[PDB]
C-alpha cells in the first residue's frame, strides 16, 4: 500500500474541465455535472453527434460510440452504495498525489445545494487538509465487492467544515 486502489483503476480518474471524471468502460464515462465544459464541440476530441450524453441531478454519463479506452475492463456502476458502507473517494490531486479517502456513505436523497438540484447521497469522511478541496468534483466513490471494484457516485460537494461529503449518484 498505501494506495489501495490498483493502478489500472487510479487510472480511470482522469482530469475533465474544473474537476475530474471517471472512465467506468471504454466507452462509458462519468463526472459530475457542474465541471463539465461548456461551449465545446467535443469532449476528448469526439464531436457530440458521437456521444450520448444523459445529465440530471448533477450526474453526468458520457456513452462514445468509439472506444476510447480499450485498456479498460467495464466496471458495475451502482446507484449510491448501501448505507452505513466504507466507501473511498479516488482523490487525484494536480500535483499527482494520489488520496483514496475512507467516508461512511449514508441516505440517498435530493438536495439542493448552491441552487443546483443534487440527487446524491452523504456521507462522513472518516476520522484517522485530511480532506477534499474544490478541485476534487468529478472523483469517484468506489468500493470492492467480492473480488471486483464497483463505482457508485462521483463528488458533488462538501460541508464548510469538510466533513461531510456528498456524491452524485445516477438515478434509476
Given at each position: 500500500?498505501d494506495?489501495?486502489?490498483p493502478?489500472t ?9 474544473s ?8 466507452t462509458?464515462?462519468?463526472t459530475t455535472?457542474?465541471?463539465v465544459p ?12 458521437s ?7 448533477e450526474?453526468?454519463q458520457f456513452?462514445?460510440?468509439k472506444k476510447m479506452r480499450?485498456?479498460l475492463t467495464?466496471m ?6 448501501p448505507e ?6 479516488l482523490?487525484?490531486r ?5 488520496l483514496?479517502?475512507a467516508?461512511r456513505?449514508?441516505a440517498?436523497?435530493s ?5 443546483r438540484?443534487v ?6 469522511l ?8 474544490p478541485?476534487d468534483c468529478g ?10 471494484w464497483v ?12 466533513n ?7 438515478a434509476g
Open positions: 500500500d494506495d489501495k486502489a493502478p483503476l487510479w487510472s480511470r480518474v482522469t482530469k475533465f474541465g474537476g475530474w471524471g471517471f472512465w467506468v468502460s471504454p462509458v464515462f462519468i455535472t457542474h465541471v461548456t461551449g465545446v464541440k467535443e469532449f476528448f476530441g469526439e464531436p457530440l453527434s456521444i450520448a450524453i444523459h445529465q440530471a441531478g450526474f453526468t456513452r462514445f460510440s480499450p485498456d467495464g458495475v456502476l451502482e446507484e449510491g452504495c452505513g458502507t466504507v466507501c473511498s473517494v482523490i487525484k494536480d500535483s499527482g498525489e494520489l483514496p479517502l467516508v456513505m449514508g440517498i436523497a438536495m439542493r445545494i448552491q441552487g438540484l440527487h446524491g447521497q452523504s456521507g462522513m472518516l476520522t484517522g487538509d485530511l480532506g477534499t478541496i478541485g472523483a469517484p466513490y468506489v468500493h470492492k465487492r467480492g473480488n471486483d463505482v457508485c457516485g462521483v463528488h458533488a460537494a462538501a460541508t464548510k467544515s469538510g461531510t461529503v456528498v456524491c452524485a449518484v445516477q
